[PDB]
Amino acid sequence: SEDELYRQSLEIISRYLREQATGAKDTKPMGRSGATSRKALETLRRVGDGVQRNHETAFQGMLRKLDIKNEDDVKSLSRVMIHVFSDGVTNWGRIVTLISFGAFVAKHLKTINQESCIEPLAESITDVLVRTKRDWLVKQRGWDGFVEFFHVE
Numbered sequence: 001s002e003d004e005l006y007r008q009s010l011e012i013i014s015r016y017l018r019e020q021a022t023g024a025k026d027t028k029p030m031g032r033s034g035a036t037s038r039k040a041l042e043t044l045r046r047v048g049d050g051v052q053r054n055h056e057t058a059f060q061g062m063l064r065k066l067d068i069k070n071e072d073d074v075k076s077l078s079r080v081m082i083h084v085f086s087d088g089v090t091n092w093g094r095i096v097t098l099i100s101f102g103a104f105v106a107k108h109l110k111t112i113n114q115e116s117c118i119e120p121l122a123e124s125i126t127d128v129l130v131r132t133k134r135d136w137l138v139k140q141r142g143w144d145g146f147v148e149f150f151h152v153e
């Protein structure tokens, strides 16, 4: 390990996807750099819930096409996310879209009773994000950049 950006990202994304899936806002110390992580999760809830509601029909359309029923379908989803997300341009708009669609897929995994796929989905989203966009995330100040961009405080 010794990759704080990856650790901080996995924690924010895992927590968001897990609470969207179940409705429960999980309690833990938020590791290192907790204030920023906390503000990032709060922001992600606001903006991510907005994306899912505003683009519900697009998201439902994509989910139907992907035909997700198991961990096998989640691995094939990560390859889709690399082509769609990584080949396209880089900004917080697309990063929130990616994470938001993750949360939408996580809600579906719970309703089809395959909630053991949620934590792997989270890891796969984090890996796509941090592995393909590392130098952009570092230049924008990571999750401090996120919080600053939405002018929250």
Ligand SMILES: CCc1sc2ncnc(O[C@H](Cc3ccccc3)C(=O)O)c2c1-c1ccc(O)c(Cl)c1C
Pocket (backbone or CB within 6 Å): 055, 058, 059, 061, 062, 080, 081, 084, 085, 088, 094, 095, 097, 098, 101
């Ligand atoms: C695997 C699906 C992914 S991962 C990802 N990561 C970042 N952006 C995405 O889409 C946006 C465009 C967008 C903004 C808001 C709602 C839906 C679309 C973009 O490419 O800029 C996507 C998409 C995606 C692409 C095309 C689509 O029709 C749908 Cl429904 C989605 C969910």
